[PDB]
Enzyme design. Structure first.
Site, mmCIF file in Angstrom:
data_model
loop_
_atom_site.group_PDB
_atom_site.id
_atom_site.type_symbol
_atom_site.label_atom_id
_atom_site.label_comp_id
_atom_site.label_asym_id
_atom_site.label_seq_id
_atom_site.Cartn_x
_atom_site.Cartn_y
_atom_site.Cartn_z
ATOM 1 N N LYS A 172 10.285 53.363 -1.579
ATOM 2 C CA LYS A 172 10.376 53.017 -2.999
ATOM 3 C C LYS A 172 9.025 52.527 -3.529
ATOM 4 C CE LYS A 172 13.915 50.765 -4.100
ATOM 5 N NZ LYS A 172 14.491 51.986 -4.738
ATOM 6 N N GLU A 189 -4.453 52.039 11.161
ATOM 7 C CA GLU A 189 -4.536 52.932 12.298
ATOM 8 C C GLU A 189 -3.457 54.006 12.149
ATOM 9 O OE1 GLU A 189 -3.843 50.850 15.839
ATOM 10 O OE2 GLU A 189 -3.390 52.618 17.083
ATOM 11 N N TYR A 190 -3.794 55.223 12.552
ATOM 12 C CA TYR A 190 -2.859 56.344 12.483
ATOM 13 C C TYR A 190 -2.259 56.574 13.868
ATOM 14 C CZ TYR A 190 -1.800 61.394 12.905
ATOM 15 O OH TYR A 190 -1.228 62.612 13.209
ATOM 16 N N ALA A 191 -0.931 56.540 13.945
ATOM 17 C CA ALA A 191 -0.242 56.773 15.208
ATOM 18 C C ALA A 191 0.248 58.207 15.187
ATOM 19 C CB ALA A 191 0.913 55.806 15.358
ATOM 20 N N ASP A 208 11.694 42.200 11.526
ATOM 21 C CA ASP A 208 12.063 43.550 11.111
ATOM 22 C C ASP A 208 12.090 44.573 12.262
ATOM 23 O OD1 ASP A 208 13.129 45.248 9.212
ATOM 24 O OD2 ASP A 208 11.180 45.683 8.273
ATOM 25 N N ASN A 268 10.406 51.224 12.140
ATOM 26 C CA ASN A 268 9.170 50.424 12.135
ATOM 27 C C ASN A 268 8.347 50.547 13.420
ATOM 28 O OD1 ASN A 268 10.122 49.559 9.669
ATOM 29 N ND2 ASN A 268 10.867 47.579 10.448
ATOM 30 N N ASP A 325 5.266 48.285 11.111
ATOM 31 C CA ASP A 325 5.469 47.773 9.749
ATOM 32 C C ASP A 325 5.781 46.274 9.710
ATOM 33 O OD1 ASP A 325 6.442 47.109 7.201
ATOM 34 O OD2 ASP A 325 7.113 49.183 6.860
HETATM 35 O O1 LIG Z 1 5.277 63.435 10.981
HETATM 36 C C1 LIG Z 1 5.764 62.264 11.071
HETATM 37 O O2 LIG Z 1 6.993 62.057 10.914
HETATM 38 C C2 LIG Z 1 4.850 61.118 11.334
HETATM 39 C C3 LIG Z 1 3.671 61.325 12.049
HETATM 40 C C4 LIG Z 1 2.805 60.266 12.273
HETATM 41 C C5 LIG Z 1 3.107 59.005 11.780
HETATM 42 N N1 LIG Z 1 2.195 57.926 12.054
HETATM 43 C C6 LIG Z 1 1.959 56.772 11.233
HETATM 44 N N2 LIG Z 1 0.802 56.109 11.412
HETATM 45 C C7 LIG Z 1 0.499 55.009 10.684
HETATM 46 C C8 LIG Z 1 1.415 54.567 9.728
HETATM 47 C C9 LIG Z 1 2.604 55.276 9.580
HETATM 48 N N3 LIG Z 1 3.550 54.833 8.616
HETATM 49 C C10 LIG Z 1 4.887 55.326 8.633
HETATM 50 C C11 LIG Z 1 5.119 56.614 8.148
HETATM 51 C C12 LIG Z 1 6.407 57.130 8.133
HETATM 52 C C13 LIG Z 1 7.453 56.350 8.608
HETATM 53 C C14 LIG Z 1 7.223 55.060 9.092
HETATM 54 C C15 LIG Z 1 5.937 54.529 9.110
HETATM 55 C C16 LIG Z 1 5.736 53.126 9.638
HETATM 56 F F1 LIG Z 1 6.267 53.037 10.858
HETATM 57 F F2 LIG Z 1 4.442 52.784 9.710
HETATM 58 F F3 LIG Z 1 6.350 52.254 8.824
HETATM 59 N N4 LIG Z 1 2.866 56.364 10.334
HETATM 60 C C17 LIG Z 1 4.291 58.809 11.082
HETATM 61 C C18 LIG Z 1 5.168 59.864 10.839
#
Ligand SMILES: O=C(O)c1ccc(Nc2nccc(Nc3ccccc3C(F)(F)F)n2)cc1
Length: 266
Positions: free
Chosen positions: A20, A88-90, A133, A138, A151
């Site tokens: 949101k 950071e990007y996961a 959370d 998350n 998160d």
């Molecule tokens: O393709 C995908 O589905 C994918 C690939 C890599 C990702 N990696 C990633 N890296 C950093 C932040 C982040 N946020 C996020 C995004 C979506 C949902 C929850 C979060 C969280 F956890 F940060 F809140 N997600 C996230 C999603």
């Protein structure tokens, strides 16, 4: 971290996730070609929630944490319409998606995630930070497949008195939280136990159709196990889901738990 960033420094890519308040984007910093994630929140959305202060606490808290199992916040910045968090990007996405995919995990993948989690929560708690959370939407996965707490929106300082009309949803909240009371780092131990159950069973142990009924399940601690949950696993989970926070284990005892040690690859 010193210099001030701006939108023009970043090439934005594929949307990672929605929300949101705003979305998370893959992005690349132009000068270094560095790949990261930009979380974009609308100022006009988040004022209505009065959360602007909890965002400031989320940012203050997350940027000061350094752990391999905790997602880095490098910095932030804002403009006219919105606010940007440089993350950071996961690369492997959420644990949620993994769980939808495998439909549920085995004892080895579970005990390992529980280990990465516990290690991370130890770090946090040593700083007197409570997450509260903790939950699979998350939690992210790094390149090596390692769990990362992502998160921090609802994290807080301990102990905490908070009654928050939403501290983030019921399935992971311990009795002391839903009942509006005082709470401490024991909150995340309960949540760890919920998560452990969700990993093996595929659904949180208090799941129900309405909030009002789930509320009832939690406060009464009513959960049952499918035949396939092993006794070792039953035992750790029963130890974690305790109405009385003080009867919950320390993370040390979690990490030292026979079923964890027999199973965790980490
Ligand atoms: O393709 C995908 O589905 C994918 C690939 C890599 C990702 N990696 C990633 N890296 C950093 C932040 C982040 N946020 C996020 C995004 C979506 C949902 C929850 C979060 C969280 F956890 F940060 F809140 N997600 C996230 C999603």
């Amino acid at each position: 971290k010193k210099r001030q960033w701006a939108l023009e420094d970043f090439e934005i890519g594929r949307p990672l996730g929605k929300g949101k308040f705003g979305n998370v984007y893959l992005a690349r910093e132009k000068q270094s070609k560095f790949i990261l994630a930009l979380k974009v929140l609308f100022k006009a959305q988040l004022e209505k929630a009065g959360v602007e202060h909890q965002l400031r606490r989320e940012v203050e808290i997350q940027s000061h944490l350094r752990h391999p199992n905790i997602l880095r916040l490098y910095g932030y910045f804002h403009d006219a319409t919105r606010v940007y968090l440089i993350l950071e990007y996961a690369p492997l996405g959420t644990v949620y998606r993994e769980l939808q995919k495998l439909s549920k995990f085995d004892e080895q993948r579970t005990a390992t995630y529980i280990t990465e989690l516990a290690n991370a929560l130890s770090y946090c708690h040593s700083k007197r930070v409570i997450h509260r959370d903790i939950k699979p939407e998350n939690l992210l996965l790094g390149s090596a497949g390692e769990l990362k707490i992502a998160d921090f929106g609802w994290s807080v300082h301990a102990p905490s008195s908070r009654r928050d009309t939403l501290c983030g949803t019921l399935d992971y909240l311990p009795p002391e939280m839903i009942e509006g009371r005082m709470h401490d780092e024991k909150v995340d131990l309960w949540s760890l136990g919920v998560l452990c159950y969700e990993f093996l069973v595929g659904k949180p142990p208090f799941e129900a159709n309405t909030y009002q009924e789930t509320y009832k399940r939690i406060s009464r601690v009513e959960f049952t196990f499918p035949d396939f949950v092993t006794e070792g696993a039953r035992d750790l989970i029963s130890r974690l889901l305790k109405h009385n926070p003080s009867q919950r284990p320390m993370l040390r005892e979690v990490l030292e738990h026979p079923w964890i040690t027999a199973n965790s690859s980490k």
